[PDB]
Design a protein around this ligand. Structure first.
Ligand SMILES: [Ca+2]
Lengths: 130, 95
């Protein structure tokens, strides 16, 4: 068993990054209502949108909010050669309305650490760039 | 090509453990995870990786590169968020 379907709304901070076509191409997390975190190798543009509160990209016309991006902050220490500091902060033009299926995730401290062996979760639609 | 939101639980593989699978490319700005027997990762690129912190789901990493298997031999690689906090605050308070 590699993984299973998630209960809708079980991971509120989890967004889907898409382009003008409406096609998902990367994941991201809501760390605030106007700030979204993601990866640099994802190459996000102000031309891309942030879909929140979604679960099934199939149909299920669940109430999803298509947020707009205003700024993109790609860590400066990141290359396509050494792929380090793979982090990117997105600033939304329109903010997100927190709710039952949309909230933000807590960030840790520069001195916080998750020891080897502790179990953590990861979520997504399985779409990687590299 | 799953249409639904998927989830998986995978522990953290020590630095030494992830090194004998990927090499020197692994630095301290990275976190690896994987579970014996697994041969697939569910997260997307830039997708979260959350661990419990005194009762709260906290972002321990971001789906970076090498996230295709997710096994103890080929653990996935994540941006160690913890180590990237000093940069996030800077921009969160200067823009
Ligand atoms: Ca939908």
């Amino acid at each position: 068993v590699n993984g299973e379907d998630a209960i809708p709304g079980s991971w509120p901070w989890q967004v889907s990054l898409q382009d003008k076509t409406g096609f998902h191409f990367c994941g991201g997390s809501l760390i605030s209502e106007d700030w979204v975190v993601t990866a640099a190798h994802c190459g996000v543009k102000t031309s891309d949108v942030v879909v929140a509160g979604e679960f099934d990209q199939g149909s299920d016309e669940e109430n999803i909010q298509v947020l707009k991006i205003a700024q993109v902050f790609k860590n400066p220490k990141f290359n396509m050669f050494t792929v380090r500091n793979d982090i990117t902060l997105l600033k939304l033009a329109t903010p997100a309305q927190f709710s039952e299926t949309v909230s933000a995730v807590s960030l840790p401290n520069v001195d916080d650490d998750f020891p080897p062996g502790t179990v953590c979760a990861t979520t997504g639609w399985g779409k990687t760039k590299y | 090509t799953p249409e639904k939101l998927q989830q998986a639980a995978l522990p953290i593989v020590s630095e030494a453990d992830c090194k004998k699978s990927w090499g020197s490319k692994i630095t301290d700005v990275m976190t690896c995870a994987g579970a014996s027997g697994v041969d697939s990762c569910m997260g997307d690129s830039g997708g979260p990786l959350v661990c419990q912190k005194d009762g709260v789901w906290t972002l321990a990493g971001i789906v970076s590169w090498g996230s295709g298997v997710c096994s103890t031999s080929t653990p996935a690689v994540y941006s160690r968020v913890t180590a990237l906090m000093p940069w996030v605050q800077q921009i969160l308070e200067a823009n």
